[PDB]
Structure formats: structure tokens, C-alpha cells
Amino acid sequence: TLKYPIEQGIVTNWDDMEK
Amino acid sequence: VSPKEILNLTSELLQKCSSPAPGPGKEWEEYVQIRTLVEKIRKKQKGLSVTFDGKREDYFPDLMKWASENGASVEGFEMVNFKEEGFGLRATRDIKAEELFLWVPRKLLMTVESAKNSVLGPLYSQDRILQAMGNIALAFHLLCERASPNSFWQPYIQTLPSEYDTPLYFEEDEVRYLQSTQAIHDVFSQYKNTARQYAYFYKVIQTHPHANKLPLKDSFTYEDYRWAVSSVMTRQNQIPTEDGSRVTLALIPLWDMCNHTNGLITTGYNLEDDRCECVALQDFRAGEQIYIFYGTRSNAEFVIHSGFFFDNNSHDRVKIKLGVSKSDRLYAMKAEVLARAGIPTSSVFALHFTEPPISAQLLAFLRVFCMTEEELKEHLLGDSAIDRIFTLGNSEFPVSWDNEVKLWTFLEDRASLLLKTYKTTIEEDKSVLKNHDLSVRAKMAIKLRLGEKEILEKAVKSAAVNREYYRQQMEEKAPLPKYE
Ligand SMILES: Nc1ncnc2c1ncn2[C@@H]1O[C@H](CSCC[C@H](N)C(=O)O)[C@@H](O)[C@H]1O
């Protein structure tokens, strides 16, 4: 299908003390 | 309000939000303590540092003109303020399912790369959080360009919302509805993360010479940061880099005005033309709102990261943490079978609002969890052991009828126990929604806590049905299915 599907609002990690 | 007072308050906020987790029973009290500090700072500040004279819709024509000059599709749709979803796109002509109706060239995007090349560049190359976390980098990129009147992206920034429905904007009593749920801990973490980051960067901007040319050196309020991270978390996207070997985070103008409905992802990146491309999810008649499918996120994720609750979310799920106990006398064998199957000894799995409610990986874990020693040996030794591990995630090939009866009995009991850890019942939540007049944000919280319990209750019923099905096969001594 789509080579680069785009998820709107994909969840990211905002925890700067773990990452 | 003197700058030294805000500096004292942000220093206190940084120390409060950098302390370790105070234990799960103390997180609500910590949350309220952090809210108190944030609100004291917010009350001593002037809101958003940069505000625009016009209304949001006054700037959509500039967005269209700006996107058109750079090669985006700008015909066949218009911006409309919809009651249910806020502003969105509405078709002005009939659009057929699978028609390529929307495309956005890379030059229009705000990316981690364009953040690197901006006025933020010097500080970006210096700060270890900005280098590690592209989402925070996008948030400051957005703020710096917002406060730059000649920014290339002004037509986009001026059409962004000024407020969101992420939990960062909830009142204390609206979040309080989430007490005893799974979701409230992520609400706590999001609030503490955001407050720590604001205080950290407030001080970093004061101390680093690399930040001397940023507009944030003159004004950087908590409202600025809450708006920026909420803009990013409700709208950001993952796209490939220009050369195609890496992924980056991006804000995609024009296309990100589309609201969410159930379906499949129909948006992809075209590296050859270097643009985002969206084909119609379904037929859209003229005058109908144009929707896309954001992704297979849960309502807890939609609420916390996207700022909305989606009724009839067909991908909704709750978490369930499970692991083999070290006090289990068969721990070593179970751990080895799981490792050979590619499954951790302990993990956070998911329960879905479907039949079955469990994935192949959770089914495989539960089978090994309930295996006898003789069954474990057959998955560890001899010429058929690897074939047995191969089918562990497959509902059509059980280990034994007894193994199935045990695992579904366990899941029924565990989901029943989880239900008993909530402050309210399903029927009480429905009564609250029926007999109280509530804000949108309050409804999101209550429906979230109702949704968690409905998924658990459906898992209880599904596990009970499966227990009876396999207990019948056992009593009737049915031949065990063999993968061949
Ligand atoms: N199905 C839906 N129901 C309610 N709100 C929705 C929705 N789909 C998208 N949204 C809203 O739209 C945001 C995603 S960006 C989509 C455009 C946005 N409505 C705007 O006015 O700029 C989400 O944060 C949420 O506020």
C-alpha cells in the first residue's frame, strides 16, 4: 500500500527524564 | 510583577517537577500541588506572548494564498467552523473515494530540520533535550516563528487554534473524574512533564548566549508553552526525510485542518514529488465535511494527546499488566518458552473492545502462563518444539483444552478484579451523563472512565464464553486441532 503512511497526531514520548 | 519573582517561581517549579515520583498514592496530591504553582505563575503573566488582531477565520485566505504559491492544492474545499469538531474542511464539489484531492509540498511543512535551520538553531545545537526530543523542538520552532512577524510560516501560525482540549486545559474538578482509572496517571505525567519543561527552558533561555536572538528572551509565558506543546501533540506527524533514509516530525499545513472519522489511513508521503498526499477516505458530496482517519489510537490517546473523545472508536483498548511470578516454581521454563517466542516475561498488554479482546501475543503469553510442566517441556525439547511455539498466538491451535479453560478462567477473574478497582460502576457513569449538565471537557473525562470499564466488562463476558466453549470440548473429549 502506502510506502509512507502518515498518522495524524501520532503519539510521541514527552517524558524528558526517561528519554 | 518583577522578573525576579517569576524567576523564583520557575526555579521552585523546576525543583518540584524534577523530584522523583512520590508513589502512586501520592500522585493526585502532587498533581494539585503542581497545578497550584503553575496557576500562580500563569496569573502573574500576560497569557500568550503574541496574539493576533483578527479572528481565526480572517486568516484562512492568506493560508490558501500562501499554500497556493508553494504548490499545494487549494481548490475544491473551504474552511467551516463545525460545532462537533471545530474548524474543518468542507467539500465545495463532489469528491470520489480514492481521488487525490489534497497535496502539500515539503517546503510548507514545519519540521525538526526547519527548526535546526531557524533562529532556534544555535540553542538547538547546544541543548540536550532539544537534540533528543524532536517534538519539543517543534514546539519551540512554532513559538519562535509565532513571535517573528516576517516568518515564512506566519499564514499557517495565524490560523492555528488559540486553545485546545488536551488535559493541560482541564479544570481540577474535570480531571478529578478520572480518579482510580488507568488514564489519570498519563494525565499526571503530561502535566508534570509540561511544567518541568517550561521551568527548565525558561531558565535555559536566560542563561544560554545561544538564545540571545530568540524572541522568547523577551517574553516566554507558561501559556506560550502549553499552547505550543498542545499544538504539536494534537497535530504533529511522522514523515520521511528528504533523502528517505530517516524519519522526522512535521506539522503539515492545510491538510491538518481535516477532522477524524473511522476508516483507514489514506495519507502518505510521496518522496518523488516531495509532498504529502491525501486521497479521499470515502465519497464526499459538495457541502459534506471532509474527514480523514487519524490512526488506530484509543480514546485515552485521543483525549490525552489529541484533545478529543471519539464515540464509536472501533480501535479502543485498555492496558493490562501481566507477568510470570518469580515465586512460580515453573518460572524458569515459562520464561524460556516466552523468550523463544519473542515475548517478555512481564509486559503491559492490551485488551480490545473486540472478540477476542486479546492479541496473538497476549494469547501466547496466557497459554504459557497456564502451562503445566509437561506442556512446557513439549515447547522446549525435541523436533516438534519449534512448531508448537510457532502456533502459540493462534486461536485455532490450543496447547490443550485444559490450558484454554485455565487461561480464560484467569482472564475472566483478572478483568473482574480490575473492574472492582474503579470508584464508580458503569451504571453510575451513565446516570451522571444522563442527569448532569456537563462541559465538553468533563464529558471527555467521564466517557473515558466509562470506556475503560466497558472494555473490561466485555472482556469478562468474552472470557466467560470462551471458558464454557473449551470446557465443552474438554468434557466431550474432542480431538485437539493439529496444524498440518
Ligand atoms: N472527530 C472529532 N470529534 C471532535 N473533535 C475532533 C475530531 N477530529 C478532530 N477533532 C479536533 O481537531 C483537532 C485535530 S486538528 C483538526 C483541525 C482542528 N479541528 C482545527 O480547528 O484546527 C483535535 O485536537 C480535536 O480538537
Residues B357 and B255 both lie in one domain: no
Residues B294 and B372 both lie in one domain: no
Residues B287 and B333 both lie in one domain: no
Residues B416 and B276 both lie in one domain: no
Q: Is B402 within a domain?
A: yes
Within 6 A (CB) of ligand 1 lie B 84-88, 161, 165, 234-235, 256-257, 259-260, 306-308, 310
Query: How was this entry determined?
Result: X-ray
Q: How far apart are CA B34 and CA B470, in angstroms?
A: 51
* Resolution of the entry in angstroms: 2.0
Number of folded domains that form chain B:
2
Residues B302 and B321 both lie in one domain: no
Q: How far apart are CA B335 and CA B99, in angstroms?
A: 50
CA–CA distance from B158 to each of B63, B65, B141, B250, B325 (Å)?
Answer: 8, 13, 15, 17, 55
Residues B141 and B287 both lie in one domain: yes
Q: Is B381 within a domain?
A: yes
Q: Is B168 within a domain?
A: yes
Select the residue of B129, B132, B256 nearest A8 (Cβ to Cβ).
B256
Residues B321 and B448 both lie in one domain: yes
Q: Is B99 within a domain?
A: no
Q: Is B358 within a domain?
A: yes
Residues B288 and B395 both lie in one domain: no
Q: Which residue does chain A place closest to B200, by CA atoms?
A: A16
Q: Is B39 within a domain?
A: yes
Asked which of B242, B273, B306 is the last residue of a domain, the reply is B306
**CATH code of the domain containing B299:** 3.90.1410.10
Asked which of B272, B306, B340 is the last residue of a domain, the reply is B306
Whether B129 has its CB under 8 Å from any CB of chain A: the answer is: yes
**CATH code of the domain containing B423:** 3.90.1420.10
Residues B388 and B258 both lie in one domain: no
Structural domain range at position B244: 3-51+107-306
Phi, then psi, of B167 in degrees rounded to 5: -60, -20
Q: Is B244 within a domain?
A: yes
Q: Is B410 within a domain?
A: yes
Cell numbers at residue B385, please?
A: 518444539
Q: Which of B188, B262, B274, B306 to mutate to test the interface with A (most CBs of A within 10 A)?
A: B306
Asked which of B277, B306, B335 is the last residue of a domain, the reply is B306
Residues B283 and B360 both lie in one domain: no
Residues B328 and B293 both lie in one domain: no
Residues B296 and B321 both lie in one domain: no
Is the Cβ–Cβ distance between B251 and B138 less than 8 Å? yes
